[PDB]
Ligand binder design. Structure first.
Ligand SMILES: O=C(O)CN(CCN(CC(=O)O)CC(=O)O)CC(=O)O
Length: 158
């Protein structure tokens, strides 16, 4: 089991970490959601699908910088919604193919009442998402750590 980002950075068997640089909507009004869809940026595959089933969770998601200060969050994982920053590990998603498939994570971020101006600075760390990978054969328990960085400013107009 291994993962890759949309620009080709890999995390190999056994886990590791990588940076993910994401374009964000440059403006988000009070009452609207800023969507950070990681499913178009993070992909994973099972190397030996005839031999083993791999299981994948969002073990935890943390917010940083302007996301932590200026937004109220939820994370959708494989169709279900949870608080973001997270308070529990999600259910497991099955990976059963050598073809890379999306990691089905999206953040829904709406401005807090105090947000105004540049609410996320371009280049800043906005999130760390920990993917936990297990399997149905042995006790392997691997962490794939995704450090999410903003490519551009996000403005909340005032
Ligand atoms: O997980 C696999 O793909 C192969 N499994 C078999 C698990 N299968 C049972 C079966 O194929 O009859 C679970 C499944 O139904 O996918 C071997 C193992 O026990 O580690």
């Amino acid at each position: 089991f291994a993962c890759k980002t949309a620009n080709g950075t890999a995390i190999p068997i056994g886990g590791g970490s990588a940076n993910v640089y994401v374009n964000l909507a440059p403006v988000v009004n009070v009452g609207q959601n800023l969507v950070v869809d990681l499913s178009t940026q993070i992909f994973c595959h099972n190397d030996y699908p005839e031999t083993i089933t791999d299981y994948v969770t969002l073990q935890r998601g943390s917010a940083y910088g302007g996301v932590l200060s200026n937004f109220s969050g939820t994370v959708k994982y494989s169709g279900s919604s949870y608080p973001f920053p997270t308070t529990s590990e999600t259910p497991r998603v099955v990976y059963n193919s050598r073809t890379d498939k999306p990691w089905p994570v999206a953040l829904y971020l709406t401005p807090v009442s105090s947000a105004g101006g540049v609410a996320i600075k371009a280049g800043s760390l906005i999130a760390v998402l920990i993917l936990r990978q297990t399997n149905n054969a042995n006790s392997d328990d691997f962490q794939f750590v995704w450090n999410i960085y903003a490519n551009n400013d996000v403005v909340v107009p005032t």
